[PDB]
Amino acid sequence: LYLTQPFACGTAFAVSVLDSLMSATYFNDNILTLIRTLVTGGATPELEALIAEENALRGGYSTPQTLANRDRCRVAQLALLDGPFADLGDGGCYGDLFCKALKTYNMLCFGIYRLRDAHLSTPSQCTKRYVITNPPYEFELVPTDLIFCLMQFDHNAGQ
Amino acid sequence: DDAICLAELKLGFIAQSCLAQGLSTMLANLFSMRSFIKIEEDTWQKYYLEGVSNEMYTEYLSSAFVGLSFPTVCELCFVKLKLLMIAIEYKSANRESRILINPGNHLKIQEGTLGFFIASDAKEVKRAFFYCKACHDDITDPKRIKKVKKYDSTGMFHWCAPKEIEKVILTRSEAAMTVLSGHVVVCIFGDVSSALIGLRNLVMPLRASNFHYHELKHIVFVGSIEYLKREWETLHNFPKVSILPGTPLSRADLRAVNINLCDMCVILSANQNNIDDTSLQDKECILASLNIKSMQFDITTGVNIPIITELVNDTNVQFLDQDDDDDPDTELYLTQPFACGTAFAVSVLDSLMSATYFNDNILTLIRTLVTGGATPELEALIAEENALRGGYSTPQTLANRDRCRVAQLALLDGPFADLGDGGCYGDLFCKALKTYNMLCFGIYRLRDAHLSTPSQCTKRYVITNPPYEFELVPTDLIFCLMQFDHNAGQ
Amino acid sequence: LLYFGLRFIAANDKLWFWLEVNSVVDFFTVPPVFVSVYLNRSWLGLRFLRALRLIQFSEILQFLNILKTSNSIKLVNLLSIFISTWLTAAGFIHLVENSGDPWENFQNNQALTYWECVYLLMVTMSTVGYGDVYAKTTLGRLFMVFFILGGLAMFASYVP
Amino acid sequence: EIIELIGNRKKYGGSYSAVSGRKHIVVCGHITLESVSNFLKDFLHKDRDDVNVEIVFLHNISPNLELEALFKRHFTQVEFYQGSVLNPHDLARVKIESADACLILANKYCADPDAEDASNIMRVISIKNYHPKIRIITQMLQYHNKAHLLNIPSWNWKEG
Ligand SMILES: CC(C)CCC[C@@H](C)[C@H]1CC[C@H]2[C@@H]3CC=C4C[C@@H](OC(=O)CCC(=O)O)CC[C@]4(C)[C@H]3CC[C@]12C
Ligand SMILES: CC(C)CCC[C@@H](C)[C@H]1CC[C@H]2[C@@H]3CC=C4C[C@@H](OC(=O)CCC(=O)O)CC[C@]4(C)[C@H]3CC[C@]12C
Numbered sequence: 001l002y003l004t005q006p007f008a009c010g011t012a013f014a015v016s017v018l019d020s021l022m023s024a025t026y027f028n029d030n031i032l033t034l035i036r037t038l039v040t041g042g043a044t045p046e047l048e049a050l051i052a053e054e055n056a057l058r059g060g061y062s063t064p065q066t067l068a069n070r071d072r073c074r075v076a077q078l079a080l081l082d083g084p085f086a087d088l089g090d091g092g093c094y095g096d097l098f099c100k101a102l103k104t105y106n107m108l109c110f111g112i113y114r115l116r117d118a119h120l121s122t123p124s125q126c127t128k129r130y131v132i133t134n135p136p137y138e139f140e141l142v143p144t145d146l147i148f149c150l151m152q153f154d155h156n157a158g159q
Numbered sequence: 160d161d162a163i164c165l166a167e168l169k170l171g172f173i174a175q176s177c178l179a180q181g182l183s184t185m186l187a188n189l190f191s192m193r194s195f196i197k198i199e200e201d202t203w204q205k206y207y208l209e210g211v212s213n214e215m216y217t218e219y220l221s222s223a224f225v226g227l228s229f230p231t232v233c234e235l236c237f238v239k240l241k242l243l244m245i246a247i248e249y250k251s252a253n254r255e256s257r258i259l260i261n262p263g264n265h266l267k268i269q270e271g272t273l274g275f276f277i278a279s280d281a282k283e284v285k286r287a288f289f290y291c292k293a294c295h296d297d298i299t300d301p302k303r304i305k306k307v308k309k310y311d312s313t314g315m316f317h318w319c320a321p322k323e324i325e326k327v328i329l330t331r332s333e334a335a336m337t338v339l340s341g342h343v344v345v346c347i348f349g350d351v352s353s354a355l356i357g358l359r360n361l362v363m364p365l366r367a368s369n370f371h372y373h374e375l376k377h378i379v380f381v382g383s384i385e386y387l388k389r390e391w392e393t394l395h396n397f398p399k400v401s402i403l404p405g406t407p408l409s410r411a412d413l414r415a416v417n418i419n420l421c422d423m424c425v426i427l428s429a430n431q432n433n434i435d436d437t438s439l440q441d442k443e444c445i446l447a448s449l450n451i452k453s454m455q456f457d458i459t460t461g462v463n464i465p466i467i468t469e470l471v472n473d474t475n476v477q478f479l480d481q482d483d484d485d486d487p488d489t490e491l492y493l494t495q496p497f498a499c500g501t502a503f504a505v506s507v508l509d510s511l512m513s514a515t516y517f518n519d520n521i522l523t524l525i526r527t528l529v530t531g532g533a534t535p536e537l538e539a540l541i542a543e544e545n546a547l548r549g550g551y552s553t554p555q556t557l558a559n560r561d562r563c564r565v566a567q568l569a570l571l572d573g574p575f576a577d578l579g580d581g582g583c584y585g586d587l588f589c590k591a592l593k594t595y596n597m598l599c600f601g602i603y604r605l606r607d608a609h610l611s612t613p614s615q616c617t618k619r620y621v622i623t624n625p626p627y628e629f630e631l632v633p634t635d636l637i638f639c640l641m642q643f644d645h646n647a648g649q
Numbered sequence: 650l651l652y653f654g655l656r657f658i659a660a661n662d663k664l665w666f667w668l669e670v671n672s673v674v675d676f677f678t679v680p681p682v683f684v685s686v687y688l689n690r691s692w693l694g695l696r697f698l699r700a701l702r703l704i705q706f707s708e709i710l711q712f713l714n715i716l717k718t719s720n721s722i723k724l725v726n727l728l729s730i731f732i733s734t735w736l737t738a739a740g741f742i743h744l745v746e747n748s749g750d751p752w753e754n755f756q757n758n759q760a761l762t763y764w765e766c767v768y769l770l771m772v773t774m775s776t777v778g779y780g781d782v783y784a785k786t787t788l789g790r791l792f793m794v795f796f797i798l799g800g801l802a803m804f805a806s807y808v809p
Numbered sequence: 810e811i812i813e814l815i816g817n818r819k820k821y822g823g824s825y826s827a828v829s830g831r832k833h834i835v836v837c838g839h840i841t842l843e844s845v846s847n848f849l850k851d852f853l854h855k856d857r858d859d860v861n862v863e864i865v866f867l868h869n870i871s872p873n874l875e876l877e878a879l880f881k882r883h884f885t886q887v888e889f890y891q892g893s894v895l896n897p898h899d900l901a902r903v904k905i906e907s908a909d910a911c912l913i914l915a916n917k918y919c920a921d922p923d924a925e926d927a928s929n930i931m932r933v934i935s936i937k938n939y940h941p942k943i944r945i946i947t948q949m950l951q952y953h954n955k956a957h958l959l960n961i962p963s964w965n966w967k968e969g
């Protein structure tokens with residue numbers, strides 16, 4: 001299943017690929033909390049204690065110590081077509097992009113979601129893309145690329 | 160011609176355990192025929208197995224006890240013959256059994272007064288019939304002795320004007336303001352289209368007339384409201400009854416009612432027979448019981464909360480405790496949760512069939528100690544109306560309140576504090592009769608009292624009818640039968 | 650002998666490894682060869698037990714990752730067990746009949762060949778039972794009586 | 810009938826023997842060919858650092874021929890014992906006192922999700938009742954059933 005095109009493009013999902021988590025959590029102690037924090041949007045001990053009592057959620061009043069829990073990196077995608085990273089779209093050095101983003105915006109790039117037919121000489125109109133996880137330092141980039149990122153919460157906003 | 164109702168007796172045993180913990184496991188051990196087992200290593204089994212050796216028999220009294228009062232006869236029997244005489248039946252135009260008798264009120268009518276005894280076997284009981292005063296005075300050893308409407312219509316239960324169900328229903332926020340202490344909380348897992356257990360048999364013993372009004376315990380039900388209204392028709396005449404809709408598995412509900420300030424917390428299930436899987440039976444009861452043990456309070460832990468739970472498959476008794484040494488071969492009567500009085504299965508009442516045949520008066524001695532005192536006249540009224548009709552107060556009705564009740568004593572302070580460390584159970588028993596006319600018939604002793612190493616567990620077990628020279632530690636409780644006091648400060 | 654040493658080391662409980670069929674056949678097969686070499690003699694003793702080594706084939710084929718499916722595993726098991734026990738019984742009959750009776754001073758010796766003994770065991774297992782060849786010594790008859798109890802049922806069950 | 814009555818015996822009865830300086834784990838629950846093959850293929854992969862923990866299965870149904878062949882292929886690092894996890898005798902047989910962890914597999918493709926969760930809850934309760942300090946890793950099918958595990962007296966999520 002892991003080699004099929006629908007799975008390699010992120011348009012399909014089956015629960016049978018989660019069976020490997022049994023052996024993954026045994027060898028490394030804190031993986032299950034890392035996944036749940038990354039995926040369920042918060043798995044802090046405060047929620048764990050509260051969810052045991054009421055098995056629900058209650059509204060509250062905002063306090064300066066409460067509003068300090070709103071600083072968590074979120075998952076987002078970026079495009080090299082336009083912006084500060086447009087210069088590196090044609091350039092093609094993945095390492096340079098990684099360092100520049102982390103130093104400036106404290107943004108962590110850990111993947112490329114590349115167009116399927118970007119490596120073919122003949123032109124095409126297919127818009128399907130697949131995932132490349134943790135490419136090496138010397139990786140060529142193309143302007144039609146999307147990079148996975150983790151972005152810091154910013155208290156101010158245009159709104 | 161006896162009919163042994165299992166549900167009535169089971170619920171009566173549980174309700175009696177509500178007043179004094181361990182009473183169900185003490186009473187269920189008086190009807191199983193067992194022999195003395197002696198072990199060498201110093202564990203709690205050593206005393207528990209000595210306790211469980213006793214059974215309850217009955218036999219007539221010799222002519223040496225004709226013109227004597229019941230306390231004097233009981234003290235004489237204990238001290239001399241090493242027998243515990245719990246109750247007698249008073250021969251008359253119609254038979255009637257008295258549980259415990261104050262002096263002067265009842266002298267032995269001599270008309271073949273049948274006494275009830277607790278002893279190892281019938282051979283020892285036979286001494287009471289052959290006792291000759293002149294011949295056997297010198298013989299010290301037990302051996303060598305040879306030839307507004309407030310009460311019920313019958314005036315035996317508390318009563319009140321009928322109340323509709325909506326006037327007693329509470330909510331989680333509402334229950335917080337009410338302050339409940341020393342109450343009884345009942346957890347039921349029933350629902351619509353399920354077998355109907357008779358909840359009248361559980362609260363009726365708790366509403367007996369021999370208790371004063373302020374001594375009554377508040378009762379709170381935690382379960383599906385749909386199931387409760389199916390039998391509220393038989394419950395709306397009792398005072399101080401409340402309902403909290405919800406689920407006993409929810410830790411939030413168990414905090415609304417002060418579950419850490421209770422006397423008991425009964426756990427019952429109604430759809431236990433419907434399940435076909437052997438393992439999945441008792442899933443609710445076992446899981447709910449473990450939930451309370453893990454709760455945290457600012458008594459600081461849920462382990463010390465007193466809980467009793469019934470089981471449909473007694474092999475699941477191993478899951479009720481963590482520090483026990485589980486074994487799938489030991490019988491239910493010997494495992495720790497049963498010995499501590501925190502479990503009860505209906506399979507222990509199978510022994511009541513054979514006990515009834517050999518002496519029919521046993522089934523009527525019990526069922527009045529256990530049930531609040533239901534009489535055949537009252538059962539006729541419930542058959543037709545099924546509403547427990549109340550009535551007015553007359554001197555004949557108010558004279559039925561005077562009957563003994565089951566209570567649990569404490570040696571930490573009071574008149575008996577001195578004997579807490581001396582260690583002569585016989586001295587306490589003799590003093591109790593001649594002073595307050597209460598009958599002591601057991602010890603509820605800490606599980607780790609004999610060990611030298613200090614511990615923190617507060618579990619206790621039952622010792623039934625200890626010998627005369629038994630040693631007493633200050634940290635233990637005494638089972639007693641207390642006389643009703645007509646007047647008492649409020 | 651060396652292969653027996655390796656199996657002994659890898660065993661968990663030495664007592665229950667010792668009380669095993671392969672260990673027993675090794676015990677009853679290997680030492681007599683050295684004894685014969687030392688004595689410069691020979692004896693056709695319990696050599697027929699060498700046919701009991703055919704049972705290990707179905708397990709060593711699984712070790713070699715050759716057999717993987719249930720039908721093939723069952724077929725190989727049945728074939729190996731049937732052939733091995735048939736040949737072992739034939740060998741025992743051959744030895745007992747050709748040798749004689751020890752308490753008779755070896756005077757009941759009936760001349761038989763291994764092929765004839767195989768034929769006799771096949772006819773006995775099939776429950777056909779001609780009168781052309783049969784056991785005539787006391788030990789042979791006793792073993793035939795005890796083998797009739799089990800071999801007949803085995804033949805009735807395995808072949809279909 | 811006699812032949813059938815004799816030989817009715819469990820070939821996988823026995824007790825595990827601990828080895829000094831080597832950990833082991835116990836696997837129970839939904840044991841089948843595909844599940845065991847996937848679990849072993851992921852557990853014994855070469856990308857992991859060198860590991861020497863033994864895997865001890867425990868199921869109450871005797872394995873079939875091809876599952877037995879799989880266990881033969883993983884001969885020196887996998888063991889099987891027949892029993893029930895709701896039995897203290899079996900739990901003591903598999904030497905669960907010194908086991909590093911206990912893994913419980915679930916049946917994802919089950920007809921009724923609730924019964925599987927209830928069975929897993931029973932298994933966890935039994936294991937923690939026998940030994941309240943072992944580490945347990947389990948699979949849950951429904952979220953509202955996972956809250957019940959938070960009420961077991963000895964279930965510590967801060968520990969693993
Ligand atoms: C499966 C294992 C335990 C081997 C068992 C073999 C025994 C059943 C056999 C092997 C040697 C036999 C013995 C070999 C020779 C003799 C001498 C024989 O007496 C003779 O001198 C023979 C001629 C005569 O009877 O005068 C009596 C039987 C006896 C003891 C035999 C009895 C049966 C024995 C002990
Ligand atoms: C347990 C299994 C593996 C082997 C069983 C072998 C038995 C069937 C053998 C072993 C000892 C034998 C006995 C050994 C010696 C004798 C004495 C022998 O008689 C004589 O030696 C002289 C008198 C006569 O001629 O009968 C008659 C047979 C008999 C009883 C044998 C009968 C067959 C026996 C019981």
Ligand SMILES: CC(C)CCC[C@@H](C)[C@H]1CC[C@H]2[C@@H]3CC=C4C[C@@H](OC(=O)CCC(=O)O)CC[C@]4(C)[C@H]3CC[C@]12C
Pocket residue numbers: 763764767
């Ligand atoms: C059950 C199926 C697989 C058939 C089994 C066939 C056996 C009964 C055959 C296969 C090999 C045969 C043997 C092959 C060679 C010889 C040697 C032969 O003798 C000689 O060659 C030397 C001279 C002599 O002594 O006659 C006598 C027959 C014999 C023992 C044969 C006897 C019958 C055997 C064991």
Ligand SMILES: CC(C)CCC[C@@H](C)[C@H]1CC[C@H]2[C@@H]3CC=C4C[C@@H](OC(=O)CCC(=O)O)CC[C@]4(C)[C@H]3CC[C@]12C
Pocket residue numbers: 762764765
């Ligand atoms: C495919 C498998 C089953 C092997 C097939 C071949 C064997 C079954 C053959 C090969 C050599 C044959 C043997 C060759 C010679 C003899 C001697 C013969 O005895 C004689 O002296 C002749 C007796 C007669 O002709 O009646 C008995 C059969 C036998 C053992 C034969 C039996 C059958 C054998 C073992």
Ligand SMILES: CC(C)CCC[C@@H](C)[C@H]1CC[C@H]2[C@@H]3CC=C4C[C@@H](OC(=O)CCC(=O)O)CC[C@]4(C)[C@H]3CC[C@]12C
Pocket residue numbers: 757785786787791
């Ligand atoms: C199942 C175990 C207990 C073995 C049962 C048999 C044995 C106890 C032995 C002991 C003495 C033997 C007997 C000793 C002598 C004879 C006479 C003998 O008469 C003959 O004509 C001899 C034939 C022959 O052996 O060649 C027949 C066998 C028989 C009854 C033997 C049969 C087998 C016997 C009973």
Ligand SMILES: Nc1ccc(Oc2c(F)c(F)c(C(F)(F)F)c(F)c2F)c(O)c1
Pocket residue numbers: 744745748749751788
């Ligand atoms: N050439 C020869 C010499 C002695 C023999 O005596 C045995 C015997 F009497 C016996 F009972 C067995 C048994 F244990 F297997 F049964 C044997 F194996 C024997 F060897 C024999 O059979 C043949």
Ligand SMILES: [Ca+2]
Pocket residue numbers: 192193194195212213214278279280
């Ligand atoms: Ca007795």
Ligand SMILES: [Ca+2]
Pocket residue numbers: 477478479480481482483484485938
């Ligand atoms: Ca236990």
Ligand SMILES: [K+]
Pocket residue numbers: 777778779
């Ligand atoms: K024939």
Ligand SMILES: [Mg+2]
Pocket residue numbers: 885886887888
């Ligand atoms: Mg091994």
